[PDB]
mmCIF file of C-alpha atoms and ligand atoms in Angstrom:
data_model
loop_
_atom_site.group_PDB
_atom_site.id
_atom_site.type_symbol
_atom_site.label_atom_id
_atom_site.label_comp_id
_atom_site.label_asym_id
_atom_site.label_seq_id
_atom_site.Cartn_x
_atom_site.Cartn_y
_atom_site.Cartn_z
ATOM 1 C CA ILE O 2 0.104 -0.306 0.376
ATOM 2 C CA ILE O 3 1.117 3.442 -1.091
ATOM 3 C CA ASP O 4 0.352 6.981 0.574
ATOM 4 C CA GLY O 5 -1.085 5.205 3.821
ATOM 5 C CA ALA O 6 -1.634 4.322 6.837
ATOM 6 C CA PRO O 7 -1.629 2.036 9.535
ATOM 7 C CA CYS O 8 -5.500 0.232 9.530
ATOM 8 C CA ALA O 9 -7.670 1.019 12.320
ATOM 9 C CA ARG O 10 -6.941 -1.694 14.930
ATOM 10 C CA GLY O 11 -9.741 -4.222 14.330
ATOM 11 C CA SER O 12 -11.742 -2.843 11.144
ATOM 12 C CA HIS O 13 -10.316 -5.404 8.687
ATOM 13 C CA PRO O 14 -11.655 -8.601 10.534
ATOM 14 C CA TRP O 15 -12.563 -10.165 6.898
ATOM 15 C CA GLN O 16 -8.722 -9.412 5.823
ATOM 16 C CA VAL O 17 -6.481 -12.260 5.220
ATOM 17 C CA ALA O 18 -2.876 -12.657 3.958
ATOM 18 C CA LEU O 19 -1.581 -15.939 1.682
ATOM 19 C CA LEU O 20 1.822 -17.262 2.637
ATOM 20 C CA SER O 21 4.073 -19.287 0.917
ATOM 21 C CA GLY O 22 6.135 -20.192 4.079
ATOM 22 C CA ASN O 23 6.077 -18.081 6.167
ATOM 23 C CA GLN O 24 6.112 -15.418 3.273
ATOM 24 C CA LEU O 25 3.563 -13.314 2.024
ATOM 25 C CA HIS O 26 1.859 -13.770 -1.208
ATOM 26 C CA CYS O 27 -1.224 -12.393 -1.511
ATOM 27 C CA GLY O 28 -4.096 -11.137 0.227
ATOM 28 C CA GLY O 29 -7.460 -11.377 0.357
ATOM 29 C CA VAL O 30 -10.691 -11.698 2.368
ATOM 30 C CA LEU O 31 -12.941 -14.037 3.971
ATOM 31 C CA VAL O 32 -16.152 -14.730 2.920
ATOM 32 C CA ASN O 33 -17.174 -17.219 5.483
ATOM 33 C CA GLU O 34 -15.657 -19.952 7.935
ATOM 34 C CA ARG O 35 -14.729 -22.032 4.798
ATOM 35 C CA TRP O 36 -14.105 -19.966 2.158
ATOM 36 C CA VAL O 37 -11.308 -17.016 0.724
ATOM 37 C CA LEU O 38 -11.975 -15.229 -2.344
ATOM 38 C CA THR O 39 -8.776 -13.392 -3.732
ATOM 39 C CA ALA O 40 -7.301 -13.094 -7.335
ATOM 40 C CA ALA O 41 -7.075 -16.171 -9.646
ATOM 41 C CA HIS O 42 -3.026 -14.675 -10.486
ATOM 42 C CA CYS O 43 -2.241 -15.752 -6.857
ATOM 43 C CA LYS O 44 -3.068 -19.359 -7.481
ATOM 44 C CA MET O 45 -0.387 -21.458 -6.054
ATOM 45 C CA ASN O 46 -1.095 -25.401 -5.656
ATOM 46 C CA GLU O 47 -1.095 -25.189 -1.192
ATOM 47 C CA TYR O 48 -1.652 -22.091 0.623
ATOM 48 C CA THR O 49 -1.008 -21.416 4.380
ATOM 49 C CA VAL O 50 -3.724 -18.428 5.009
ATOM 50 C CA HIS O 51 -3.208 -15.995 7.647
ATOM 51 C CA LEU O 52 -6.018 -14.611 9.919
ATOM 52 C CA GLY O 53 -7.233 -12.792 12.705
ATOM 53 C CA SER O 54 -4.836 -9.687 13.440
ATOM 54 C CA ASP O 55 -3.660 -7.007 11.119
ATOM 55 C CA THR O 56 -0.338 -7.650 12.048
ATOM 56 C CA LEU O 57 1.326 -10.120 10.238
ATOM 57 C CA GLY O 58 3.473 -12.777 12.049
ATOM 58 C CA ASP O 59 1.049 -12.461 15.315
ATOM 59 C CA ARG O 60 1.346 -14.953 17.833
ATOM 60 C CA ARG O 61 -2.949 -14.639 18.827
ATOM 61 C CA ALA O 62 -3.179 -15.043 14.384
ATOM 62 C CA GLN O 63 -4.806 -18.003 12.839
ATOM 63 C CA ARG O 64 -3.124 -19.911 10.397
ATOM 64 C CA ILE O 65 -4.864 -22.513 8.477
ATOM 65 C CA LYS O 66 -3.932 -24.257 5.894
ATOM 66 C CA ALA O 67 -5.781 -24.508 2.446
ATOM 67 C CA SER O 68 -4.986 -27.318 -0.137
ATOM 68 C CA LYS O 69 -7.781 -26.690 -2.881
ATOM 69 C CA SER O 70 -8.287 -23.215 -4.760
ATOM 70 C CA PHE O 71 -10.941 -22.618 -7.735
ATOM 71 C CA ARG O 72 -10.266 -19.927 -10.101
ATOM 72 C CA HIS O 73 -12.569 -18.804 -12.269
ATOM 73 C CA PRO O 74 -13.255 -20.677 -15.534
ATOM 74 C CA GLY O 75 -13.000 -17.842 -17.583
ATOM 75 C CA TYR O 76 -9.768 -15.671 -16.457
ATOM 76 C CA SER O 77 -6.702 -15.054 -18.575
ATOM 77 C CA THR O 78 -3.833 -15.357 -17.871
ATOM 78 C CA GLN O 79 -2.783 -13.339 -20.773
ATOM 79 C CA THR O 80 -5.109 -10.662 -19.692
ATOM 80 C CA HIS O 81 -6.481 -10.779 -16.485
ATOM 81 C CA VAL O 82 -9.709 -10.451 -17.099
ATOM 82 C CA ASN O 83 -12.156 -12.484 -14.657
ATOM 83 C CA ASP O 84 -9.422 -12.396 -11.979
ATOM 84 C CA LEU O 85 -10.779 -14.165 -9.333
ATOM 85 C CA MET O 86 -10.513 -17.498 -7.152
ATOM 86 C CA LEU O 87 -11.947 -18.877 -4.330
ATOM 87 C CA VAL O 88 -9.317 -20.737 -1.585
ATOM 88 C CA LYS O 89 -10.996 -23.916 0.155
ATOM 89 C CA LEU O 90 -9.818 -23.720 4.109
ATOM 90 C CA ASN O 91 -8.549 -27.486 5.112
ATOM 91 C CA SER O 92 -10.245 -26.482 8.425
ATOM 92 C CA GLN O 93 -13.423 -23.948 9.254
ATOM 93 C CA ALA O 94 -11.710 -20.578 10.500
ATOM 94 C CA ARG O 95 -12.895 -20.143 14.182
ATOM 95 C CA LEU O 96 -15.032 -16.857 13.694
ATOM 96 C CA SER O 97 -14.316 -13.820 16.557
ATOM 97 C CA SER O 98 -14.873 -9.938 16.903
ATOM 98 C CA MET O 99 -10.987 -10.419 14.782
ATOM 99 C CA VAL O 100 -12.259 -12.600 12.710
ATOM 100 C CA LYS O 101 -15.367 -12.024 10.376
ATOM 101 C CA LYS O 102 -17.252 -12.752 7.137
ATOM 102 C CA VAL O 103 -17.057 -9.754 4.119
ATOM 103 C CA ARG O 104 -20.374 -8.467 3.868
ATOM 104 C CA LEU O 105 -20.573 -9.053 -0.019
ATOM 105 C CA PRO O 106 -21.928 -6.965 -2.476
ATOM 106 C CA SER O 107 -25.426 -7.053 -3.473
ATOM 107 C CA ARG O 108 -24.654 -3.625 -5.578
ATOM 108 C CA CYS O 109 -22.218 -1.932 -7.721
ATOM 109 C CA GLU O 110 -21.363 0.851 -6.387
ATOM 110 C CA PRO O 111 -20.861 4.001 -8.294
ATOM 111 C CA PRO O 112 -17.930 6.383 -9.803
ATOM 112 C CA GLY O 113 -16.713 8.260 -7.316
ATOM 113 C CA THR O 114 -17.719 6.551 -3.946
ATOM 114 C CA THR O 115 -14.711 6.604 -1.113
ATOM 115 C CA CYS O 116 -12.759 3.192 -0.590
ATOM 116 C CA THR O 117 -10.452 1.546 1.213
ATOM 117 C CA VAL O 118 -8.255 -0.538 0.034
ATOM 118 C CA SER O 119 -5.644 -2.578 2.593
ATOM 119 C CA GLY O 120 -2.923 -4.718 2.799
ATOM 120 C CA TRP O 121 0.699 -5.859 3.794
ATOM 121 C CA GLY O 122 2.682 -5.100 0.440
ATOM 122 C CA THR O 123 5.386 -3.203 -0.272
ATOM 123 C CA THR O 124 5.216 0.476 0.982
ATOM 124 C CA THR O 125 7.519 1.293 -1.536
ATOM 125 C CA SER O 126 8.195 1.157 -5.266
ATOM 126 C CA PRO O 127 10.197 0.218 -6.980
ATOM 127 C CA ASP O 128 12.996 0.042 -3.940
ATOM 128 C CA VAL O 129 10.366 -2.980 -1.445
ATOM 129 C CA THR O 130 9.725 -2.218 2.128
ATOM 130 C CA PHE O 131 6.918 -5.178 3.274
ATOM 131 C CA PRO O 132 4.648 -4.260 6.678
ATOM 132 C CA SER O 133 3.892 -6.306 9.212
ATOM 133 C CA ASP O 134 0.783 -3.697 10.055
ATOM 134 C CA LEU O 135 -1.839 -3.799 7.478
ATOM 135 C CA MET O 136 -1.970 -1.389 5.585
ATOM 136 C CA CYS O 137 -4.983 1.373 4.465
ATOM 137 C CA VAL O 138 -5.517 4.251 1.891
ATOM 138 C CA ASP O 139 -8.625 5.714 0.862
ATOM 139 C CA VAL O 140 -9.265 6.207 -3.164
ATOM 140 C CA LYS O 141 -12.582 6.961 -4.936
ATOM 141 C CA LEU O 142 -13.604 4.420 -7.772
ATOM 142 C CA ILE O 143 -13.621 6.406 -10.902
ATOM 143 C CA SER O 144 -15.897 5.557 -13.910
ATOM 144 C CA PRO O 145 -14.936 3.221 -16.339
ATOM 145 C CA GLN O 146 -14.568 5.730 -19.760
ATOM 146 C CA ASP O 147 -12.255 7.971 -17.178
ATOM 147 C CA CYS O 148 -10.083 4.996 -16.700
ATOM 148 C CA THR O 149 -10.183 4.058 -20.136
ATOM 149 C CA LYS O 150 -7.945 6.845 -21.497
ATOM 150 C CA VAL O 151 -5.262 5.620 -19.413
ATOM 151 C CA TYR O 152 -5.380 2.088 -19.593
ATOM 152 C CA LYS O 153 -7.386 1.784 -23.395
ATOM 153 C CA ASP O 154 -7.782 -1.876 -24.898
ATOM 154 C CA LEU O 155 -6.645 -3.553 -21.193
ATOM 155 C CA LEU O 156 -9.463 -2.187 -19.506
ATOM 156 C CA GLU O 157 -12.897 -5.229 -19.469
ATOM 157 C CA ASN O 158 -15.994 -3.902 -17.840
ATOM 158 C CA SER O 159 -15.736 -6.352 -14.963
ATOM 159 C CA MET O 160 -13.075 -4.515 -13.973
ATOM 160 C CA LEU O 161 -13.351 -1.712 -11.710
ATOM 161 C CA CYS O 162 -11.019 1.166 -10.827
ATOM 162 C CA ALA O 163 -9.710 3.354 -8.234
ATOM 163 C CA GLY O 164 -7.664 6.626 -7.493
ATOM 164 C CA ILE O 165 -7.336 9.887 -6.029
ATOM 165 C CA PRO O 166 -5.909 12.593 -8.557
ATOM 166 C CA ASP O 167 -2.427 13.274 -8.746
ATOM 167 C CA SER O 168 -1.833 10.932 -5.893
ATOM 168 C CA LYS O 169 0.385 8.535 -5.271
ATOM 169 C CA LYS O 170 -1.749 6.480 -3.344
ATOM 170 C CA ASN O 171 -2.800 2.852 -4.013
ATOM 171 C CA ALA O 172 -1.794 -0.927 -4.073
ATOM 172 C CA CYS O 173 1.734 -2.438 -4.683
ATOM 173 C CA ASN O 174 3.245 -5.713 -4.857
ATOM 174 C CA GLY O 175 1.738 -8.237 -1.684
ATOM 175 C CA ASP O 176 -1.411 -6.238 -2.130
ATOM 176 C CA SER O 177 -2.353 -8.446 -4.764
ATOM 177 C CA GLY O 178 -5.754 -9.925 -4.453
ATOM 178 C CA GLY O 179 -7.152 -8.082 -1.414
ATOM 179 C CA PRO O 180 -10.069 -5.887 -0.691
ATOM 180 C CA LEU O 181 -11.294 -2.798 -1.717
ATOM 181 C CA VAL O 182 -14.325 -1.836 0.633
ATOM 182 C CA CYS O 183 -16.926 0.867 -0.460
ATOM 183 C CA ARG O 184 -19.833 1.842 2.136
ATOM 184 C CA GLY O 185 -19.160 -1.657 4.227
ATOM 185 C CA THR O 186 -19.658 -3.916 0.924
ATOM 186 C CA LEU O 187 -16.862 -5.672 -0.859
ATOM 187 C CA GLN O 188 -16.368 -3.822 -4.268
ATOM 188 C CA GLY O 189 -12.828 -4.618 -5.347
ATOM 189 C CA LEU O 190 -10.426 -7.144 -5.701
ATOM 190 C CA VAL O 191 -6.651 -6.025 -6.162
ATOM 191 C CA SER O 192 -5.649 -7.038 -9.867
ATOM 192 C CA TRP O 193 -3.510 -5.351 -11.467
ATOM 193 C CA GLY O 194 -1.550 -1.293 -12.547
ATOM 194 C CA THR O 195 1.353 0.323 -13.062
ATOM 195 C CA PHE O 196 4.826 -0.087 -12.294
ATOM 196 C CA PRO O 197 6.463 1.477 -10.315
ATOM 197 C CA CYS O 198 3.382 1.590 -7.702
ATOM 198 C CA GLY O 199 2.302 4.554 -7.076
ATOM 199 C CA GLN O 200 2.636 6.654 -10.264
ATOM 200 C CA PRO O 201 0.095 9.489 -10.003
ATOM 201 C CA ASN O 202 -2.903 8.889 -13.014
ATOM 202 C CA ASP O 203 -2.257 5.639 -12.880
ATOM 203 C CA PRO O 204 -5.525 4.294 -11.135
ATOM 204 C CA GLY O 205 -5.466 0.708 -9.642
ATOM 205 C CA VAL O 206 -7.006 -2.076 -11.335
ATOM 206 C CA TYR O 207 -9.737 -3.845 -9.592
ATOM 207 C CA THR O 208 -11.992 -7.267 -10.391
ATOM 208 C CA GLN O 209 -15.096 -5.739 -9.682
ATOM 209 C CA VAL O 210 -16.846 -7.900 -7.236
ATOM 210 C CA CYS O 211 -20.473 -6.686 -7.694
ATOM 211 C CA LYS O 212 -20.216 -8.757 -11.373
ATOM 212 C CA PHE O 213 -19.346 -12.047 -10.044
ATOM 213 C CA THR O 214 -21.564 -12.391 -6.855
ATOM 214 C CA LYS O 215 -23.193 -15.545 -8.568
ATOM 215 C CA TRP O 216 -20.131 -17.369 -9.940
ATOM 216 C CA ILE O 217 -18.983 -16.821 -6.312
ATOM 217 C CA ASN O 218 -21.890 -18.298 -4.636
ATOM 218 C CA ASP O 219 -22.728 -21.179 -6.632
ATOM 219 C CA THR O 220 -18.925 -22.120 -6.428
ATOM 220 C CA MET O 221 -19.393 -22.414 -2.974
ATOM 221 C CA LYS O 222 -22.516 -24.696 -3.174
ATOM 222 C CA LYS O 223 -20.646 -26.767 -5.534
ATOM 223 C CA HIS O 224 -17.989 -27.948 -3.672
ATOM 224 C CA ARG O 225 -19.830 -28.123 0.015
HETATM 225 C C1 8VX J 307 3.346 -3.074 -9.921
HETATM 226 O O1 8VX J 307 2.314 -3.278 -8.949
HETATM 227 C C2 8VX J 307 1.281 -3.004 -9.007
HETATM 228 C C3 8VX J 307 0.610 -2.043 -9.754
HETATM 229 C C4 8VX J 307 -0.619 -1.410 -9.524
HETATM 230 C C5 8VX J 307 -1.555 -2.358 -8.728
HETATM 231 CL CL1 8VX J 307 -3.337 -1.800 -7.881
HETATM 232 C C6 8VX J 307 -1.426 -3.498 -7.959
HETATM 233 C C7 8VX J 307 0.282 -4.005 -8.413
HETATM 234 C C8 8VX J 307 0.591 -5.236 -7.626
HETATM 235 C C9 8VX J 307 1.113 -6.341 -8.279
HETATM 236 C C10 8VX J 307 -0.769 -6.424 -9.012
HETATM 237 N N1 8VX J 307 -1.168 -7.224 -10.238
HETATM 238 C C11 8VX J 307 0.262 -8.530 -11.051
HETATM 239 N N2 8VX J 307 0.457 -9.014 -11.438
HETATM 240 N N3 8VX J 307 -1.099 -9.211 -12.422
HETATM 241 C C12 8VX J 307 -1.854 -10.074 -12.685
HETATM 242 C C13 8VX J 307 -0.415 -8.678 -13.541
HETATM 243 C C14 8VX J 307 1.585 -8.811 -9.395
HETATM 244 N N4 8VX J 307 1.344 -8.591 -8.817
HETATM 245 C C15 8VX J 307 1.513 -9.696 -7.454
HETATM 246 C C16 8VX J 307 2.802 -9.904 -6.586
HETATM 247 O O2 8VX J 307 3.899 -9.699 -7.346
HETATM 248 N N5 8VX J 307 3.061 -10.154 -5.466
HETATM 249 C C17 8VX J 307 4.181 -10.082 -4.800
HETATM 250 C C18 8VX J 307 4.239 -10.554 -3.080
HETATM 251 C C19 8VX J 307 5.105 -10.519 -2.581
HETATM 252 C C20 8VX J 307 6.400 -10.251 -2.756
HETATM 253 C C21 8VX J 307 6.485 -9.574 -4.569
HETATM 254 S S1 8VX J 307 8.529 -9.182 -4.936
HETATM 255 C C22 8VX J 307 9.211 -10.280 -5.794
HETATM 256 O O3 8VX J 307 7.759 -8.207 -5.616
HETATM 257 O O4 8VX J 307 9.316 -8.858 -3.511
HETATM 258 C C23 8VX J 307 5.577 -10.083 -5.162
HETATM 259 C C24 8VX J 307 0.959 -7.602 -7.439
HETATM 260 O O5 8VX J 307 1.049 -7.726 -6.330
HETATM 261 CL CL1 CL J 308 -8.391 -24.393 -11.132
HETATM 262 CL CL1 CL J 309 -13.829 -28.634 9.939
#
C-alpha cells in the first residue's frame, strides 16, 4: 500500500493473507468459515492463510492451510480478465471479533464513491519495504470511460478502477487479491496496475466483485 497508514486496529476482520512458507504471497478476504476470495493470479498448489490480526506474524493469529483453490473458469493469464479465485480452507476458521465474514455486495457502487484498500504489500516502489502492520489507503472509484483513457484496450467492464487525482495512493506488490471496500461491502479485489506503484494518474485496477456474486455463491455451494 502506497502513501497510506496502518489500518485502524480491528476494522478489517475479514482481511486475510496468503503465505507461502512464512512469506507473503497475496491478500484476500474471508467470505465465510470455509472460504477465501482472492485473485486468480495468486494461484498456488497449497496455501497458508493468515487470519485474525492486522499484524503479520502475530502469536494471536490463526493460520489455516488450504489445499484446494478454484479460479474463475473465464480467467485469462494473458489479459487477467476475470481475476478471481476461491480458496477452500482445510478446516473452518473460528470466527471472533477479529475474524469476520466480508459483507458481499448486492450492488455495484458508482463512480466517485470513497473506498478503502488494505494490504501488507510493499509500502514502496520500485525498492521494496514490507510491513507487518496492515496498511490502508482511501481511494475513489473512477468511472469506466475515465479509466479507459489511461488503460485503453486492457480494460474489461468487469474490472473496476480506483485512485485519487494526482495521487500516489494505491496498492502495490503483495497487496494482490486483497479487498477494496466501499460503503461496507466488498467492491474490489486488487488485480493490476502500473509499475512502479504509485505513479500519479495511473489508477489501480480491481476485479469488480459486484459482477461475480453468482459465480461466487454457486462455487461455494458446488464444493460443499
Ligand atoms: C506494479 O504492481 C502493481 C501496480 C498496481 C496495483 Cl493496483 C497493484 C500492483 C501489485 C501487483 C498486481 N498485479 C500483478 N500481476 N498482474 C496479474 C499483472 C502482480 N502482483 C503480484 C506480486 O508481485 N506479488 C508479490 C508478493 C510478494 C512479494 C513480491 S516481490 C518479489 O515483488 O517483492 C511480489 C502484484 O502484487
Ligand atoms: Cl483451477
Ligand atoms: Cl472442520
